[model samples]
Target: MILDTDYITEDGKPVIRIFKKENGEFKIEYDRTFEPYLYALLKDDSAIEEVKKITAERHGTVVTVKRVEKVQKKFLGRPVEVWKLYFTHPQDVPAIMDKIREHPAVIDIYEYDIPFAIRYLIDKGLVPMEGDEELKLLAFDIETLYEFAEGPILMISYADEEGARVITWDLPYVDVVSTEREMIKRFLRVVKEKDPDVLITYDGDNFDFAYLKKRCEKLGINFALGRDGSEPKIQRMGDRFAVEVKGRIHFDLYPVIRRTINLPTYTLEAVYEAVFGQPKEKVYAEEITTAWETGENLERVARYSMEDAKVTYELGKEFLPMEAQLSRLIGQSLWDVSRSSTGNLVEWFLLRKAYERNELAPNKPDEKELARRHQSHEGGYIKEPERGLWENIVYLDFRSLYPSIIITHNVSPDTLNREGCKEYDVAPQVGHRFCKDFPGFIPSLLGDLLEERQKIKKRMKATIDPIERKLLDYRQRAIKILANSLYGYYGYARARWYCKECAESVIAWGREYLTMTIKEIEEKYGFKVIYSDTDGFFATIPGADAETVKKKAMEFLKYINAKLPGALELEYEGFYKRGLFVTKKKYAVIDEEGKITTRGLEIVRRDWSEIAKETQARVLEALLKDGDVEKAVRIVKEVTEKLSKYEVPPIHKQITRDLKDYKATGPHVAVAKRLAARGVKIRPGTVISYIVLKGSGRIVDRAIPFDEKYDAEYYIEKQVLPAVERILRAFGYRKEDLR
Candidate 1:
């Protein structure tokens, strides 16, 4: 990948270079100084001819490469330690691969054999390179089935410990790795030789890995990842899963990034932007998906993909240090996640499988099951019998619950009688009952996943590594949530995976288990169980501080373990004091050790009016610290009061004009059409006709009618101000006190 930044010479003159492959060597030679690498890359391509033509018409000269003599000068008075590829007659370097190889200084040439190039890169100096001895990473990514053969294959790209590089085959260098077969071969070779210390992918564990495995098998290539060339040691990771890979570890970046980073979107692009600066272009995840699907622009796609690779690579470089630091704090000695181009979905799928089985009956009818009786099916959901406010709720969750469950449950859809099966029941957690067989199966086969996830978690814990530890923390949290939520998806009739009876059964069983566990707490420790979720329970302990609660929670966990064994676990996640009110949901939980554990911000909207979210967070923080409830309440009231004080007539009129103009724009006309569904009457000419909420019309003059009160008071007092105060009140605050 090339970076576009100016480097001043010792004499203080700016120098430009194109990192190009010349005569199978890497060297930096003099090239035009372009501010962005995209501009430099597109200089001579016929693909961008139209753009060039337009530029020429405007600037008198099209943006194309001009031949320049090789100039060698001390850059910033420092000797260049790394290779820089500079091209002569940038337009002359037509073929990208050839252009790279043409550079006289470029050495260590790896050909277009995608997998081979990756493996060779890793073998030579990519993995375990200098400065990375302790943290050698075999970065892996995959390009799968091509949706557009007429253009380029849209493969899911990713990278591992070295970080991820998720792009399509539309990148500048992707043309060389033309065939999927070759790409698959290269992928296998990298896995086999590099033996990456960690496998990292955005979603490679399930989707990308499966796609590649199937592709490799289709081509009759060995997809046995962890085994030697001759011997395959396919160990059971649990659920509908097992892998025969070895040497490297596997970690998915999605969940980790999701929990850690505060970004605009969950896509990889958003991850990069949040961690690093803005990307080379404004290209976002939605843009990439749309471009790929439309297949109208190939060059655009290529540029976008390459940019993604560069950005993702930078993100990995920046964040891996933090990931490594966290890894060491845990017991893991090395990074346990492997370097992959995709995130681990197989593990996710497996974990969900195990959770399904332990939580519900496989083949039994929901009507006959005792555990399925308490649930109320309303709004197509098996919900609690009655809705009431839950207080003094202590959330106790298992550590890496689902993955651990999979390991412990001996679940697998692959149907293997493994060593751990003797201790408990081990069967394919799919397409069958507790005792009977069934033709139809769970649409997603989550039962098998839950089983497998548990097994993997157990095994992973036993074989600890520094990197693995951190990755495990994130993965475990994600799996637990996913597993617990899968039942809701399966049971709720409104859920996409809704199996009416199965959904009811799962919720009923969950409630029963929660009730049973709550009773256990009450009987043994004299604690009041307030509410519970899939893997956690909320309990109230009178006259107990957080430390006391922690101790009691641990004791309860032990007690439950004795009764349920490995099937369920209890962990003291966190606690809050004097927690109550409308915005109680917005407060975060701080454990006895003072680490923020559980998160709540329900009072905050996804897209707020700036003041609302900011105030809400501040109020929530105050609440968690047990701040003065009256003071917090006052803050909210002050904000609301400010909103009401604003003169509404002029602002409302301006807002209406802006809305009208917005509706007049090209795409927004459709939006206006939809708004017309309401009694909003928007016409072409009259101001009153344009009085439609955000209606547009040509200039017109009329006597402005007396502006009625804009209801700003109603909005501020009821909708806006109340939400802010509610959040603040959670910390024992009142809005009036701030005044």
Candidate 2:
């Protein structure tokens, strides 16, 4: 089966190169398809000749224009005469189409086959081989000098099934090589010899591979890391750079890291620690330059590099299987699946399903429609949390709430508000009705997905083989993700199946059900509903033990499940030992296992200082776990004192936008601008180490580097105080208590 495709030029003609694997063996084949073309719907047959003439006049050698029957119906099932404009190169089709779009005959343009040949595989159902086969995977990392633009490639560390190796340039490491050029050559040789099917890296697109490419270019060496002996081609995609190698799939683990897990930091050390529950060896970028300059302890640096490569390889082992299942489910390349958003995956799956069912996919929304749809609407329901610490709290969640709503109510564009609908499920508040007789496409597909997930989960429970269980878990997760995102995809402006009414109606029903469940639990079950947000609610049976609370929660769940329709079932998520509800969507709880779980806290937010986040986390731990309000207050007071004395650690702050793009100036933006003004290059997503200092015009102006003295007052008041007060207020301790 063909997994992915690229193109190579042979004698000035593009040859499509396919990455195909069959029976555990991979092969590369070069072939050509019928000339890639797109449809240009014309007003009538008379203007077809005019379009031909125009096409011949402009891009005559590159493209050919001919008349063809409209393969797909347009304009409400009318037979429309369309001109098929063929292109010599698939990549040039979009640009040429844009130029010819203003012509009088061009009523509309459709991209049938452009840019990617794998689309053909998807259309023919020849992609995404059913079961997985062992593929040769390589995970690599590079250590460089501190300066990115002018850095020499110091060390190249890589790991695969064979084991780990570090190739360095004249370092103190045992496996060190002699020269920088020799190191690059050794990397090329190793990659070519290994012939990996997939190459994995953490942030390789942004930093590692990008830096290697620059260093190779500077040193006049060929970065021939591809199976076809072609250099790594760097494609600029917004703020990210995708380094595509021929015959090998390059999967960057960074996107999936951010998408799948919520982490305090995305640094390799932090992510590795979070995922594996073990601390990885820390290697600061500055240490590379320091070791290189001092000519001492270079072995430590090489080991650091090796550890990074090993960690990345280990991460790939854990994440890639899941991504492979997702690729199969979505009918896309594993590379694309790893990098794509949930919405994009759902859209692709929907498009493939639509094609199979002979359904016409809706046209993408124009800029105006997209902008109109971008307007915010009433989202999921969140009741204001009953603010206080409560014991014996039980958590109940509506399993796949949005997805169940979409399926149960028959919510789809086709079934929505149909005239003379005998039976219907009307959404609360919105009053949007869906026909009951017609099983809508979205609901039917979602139902199948939910059923498949359930089947996999059931099998997973009985299966004892670790490998089989992992695959089943991955497949079930992929299905659940797709099913869960269907409702949101309906509202996504860029989605081909975008339907605002269906999206809003799904959420409306969600609110209605959640609100009803909250009232039932509180009034009927005699449980104090401490919090309710979107799908889940936390309620406490006052003065009850954990066992009693669990029983009551189970009873409430059965009641709600019986009252609900279709797959709308309430699940008892957990029984909490204690919970402190601050406000809607913000709370901290100690689970039955005595682990502290917090939501909407400063520790989870990105904009806060590390000191602030750490302080907040420590306070929560002290309060929730120890149940000592005085100890939590003392912890806050100690942190505040440290902050007042300017002993706080330097906090890493992220510059979310480019300096010039800052319309509303904030401290991070100000620091970015200052860095840019001083001739330091700062990218949009670069994180800057910032400290708030005294003697400033504004808070923005006061932001400076860690080398400068910090403002004790600012850290104490703005950073430490607010985080401390957020939790302490629920326990009847105010700002005055810390003082």
Top lDDT model: 2
- Model 2 steric clash pairs: none
Q: TM-scores of the models, in the given order?
A: 0.40, 0.88
Instruction: State the lDDT of candidate 1 residue by residue for 56-84, as single tens digits.
Output: 11124233322222222221112222222
Model 1 CA deviation exceeding 4 Å by range: 1-269, 273-309, 314-393, 398-506, 577-604, 642-670, 674-718, 722-739
| Per-residue lDDT of candidate 2, residues 608-720 (tens digit) | 65445566777777777777887887787776667676573556666666666667877767777877778778875577777665584788878877665244456557555
Each model's lDDT: 0.42, 0.76
After aligning candidate 1 to the native by TM-score, how far in Å is the CA of 155 from where it should be?
A: 20
Report the number of the highest-TM-score candidate. Answer: 2
